Structure formats: C-alpha cells, structure tokens
From TrEMBL:
Similarity section: Belongs to the protein kinase superfamily. Ser/Thr protein kinase family. CDC5/Polo subfamily.
Parent-protein residues present: 847 to 1056 of 1058
Superkingdom of the organism of origin: Eukaryota
Domain POLO box: 18-110, 137-205
The protein, known as: Serine/threonine-protein kinase PLK
Length: 206
C-alpha cells in the first residue's frame, strides 16, 4: 500500500469542517424531502432532494441572525444571505423547516439524546458561533442501501461517506481517500483492495 496520513492530513480529517450529525426532513409527515446537518458552530443546514424546487440548500445561524440560501449549484453557486426577517417574509416555507429542525436538534441535546445520526468522530468543539466564517453546506447526497453507505459532497469539495456506523471515508483530493474511525485513527484507503469500491464509484459517478 501507500504512505500513511501526514500530520497536516490528520489535522484536516479530524479538525476540518465535517458533518457532526445528520438526519432528515420530515421528522412524522411523509417520506424524506431533505437532509438536515450540522457542520459549523451555530449553523444548522438543510439540503432539498427535489430537483424541481428552486432552493437547493439553506443554512440557519440564529446568533448571526442570517439564513444563507443556495438557489442553484448547477454552476458557479448562486447564493443569497438573508436576514431572519427577510427569510420569514420571502422564503417562509424554508424558514419554517430550518426552524423546526433547529428546535428538534436543541430539544434532543437538552434531553441528552442524540439529535441525529452521529458522526463516528466528533471533536471537543470550541463551538460557540461561526461569526465571519464562510458557509459550508451539502452540494449532493447519495445513499446505497445494500452497504448502508450515506455519502455527502460538501460545498468546499470535501467528500464524507458514512459506511453504516462502523467507520467513515473522508477526503479532499479524490486520489487520496481516508478511513476515519471512532477513536480518531485516520488511515489511507487502498482503493485497489477496498471491497466497497465498485459500490462507492457508482455513488460518486452516477
């Protein structure tokens, strides 16, 4: 196999902007029409599954009093930064979902329950708020049921795959994929001998 993870690579795979937890919208209601997630402090995002819908993603920062709205990722990323009053008076449907999910997540944490499907590795976060920091959202989501893989491609180019609960795959450069474990061990995925390679390649390029 190849060279193990460099100290800079291990710092990126464990302290970069990654999904700390994710779940779906609706939470009863009908089937799923969006995936909700938490990447940055104070920010709860949602990414809509339906291609007919004009809003691709929206991120809610209650403390920053803003809603970051992505309308198209077809490229270029057509995005807006609306205030909480502008979101309520223009994109009410999206604002209601964003607020329903923020209320669900904070209620789960105030109860000691897991707010969603937890990441295998979540770090002691300085958290607080992301004042100033740019916005990281989910560009695409994919699920393969035979393996229980849940792959996400983040707006910053990073890919994060949740393989069941067993482990995760995280990477920035496509030809240097890593395997992150619950204990913070990062290893280089040798895609030549990896058994879910065909299943992963269909998810990325399909």
């Amino acid at each position: 196999s190849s060279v193990p993870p460099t100290p800079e690579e291990r710092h990126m795979l464990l302290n970069g902007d990654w999904i700390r937890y994710y779940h779906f919208y609706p939470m009863e209601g009908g089937d799923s029409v969006a995936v909700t997630y938490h990447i940055q402090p104070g920010r709860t995002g949602v990414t809509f599954f339906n291609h007919s819908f004009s809003v691709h993603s929206a991120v809610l920062s209650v403390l920053e009093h803003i809603v970051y709205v992505v309308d198209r990722v077809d490229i270029n990323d057509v995005a807006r930064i609306l205030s909480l009053a502008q979101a309520l008076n223009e994109e009410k449907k999206i604002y209601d979902v964003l607020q329903l999910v923020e209320t669900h997540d904070t209620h789960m944490l105030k109860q000691r329950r897991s707010p969603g499907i937890m990441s295998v590795y979540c770090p002691p976060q300085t958290a607080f708020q992301c004042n100033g920091d740019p916005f990281v959202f989910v560009r695409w989501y994919r699920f393969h049921m035979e393996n229980s893989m849940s792959g996400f491609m983040l707006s910053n180019g990073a890919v994060q795959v949740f393989v069941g609960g067993k482990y995760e795959l995280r990477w920035l450069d496509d030809n240097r994929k890593f395997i992150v474990r619950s204990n913070g061990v990062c290893e280089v995925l040798d895609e030549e001998k990896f058994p879910l390679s065909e299943e992963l390649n269909q998810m990325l390029y399909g």
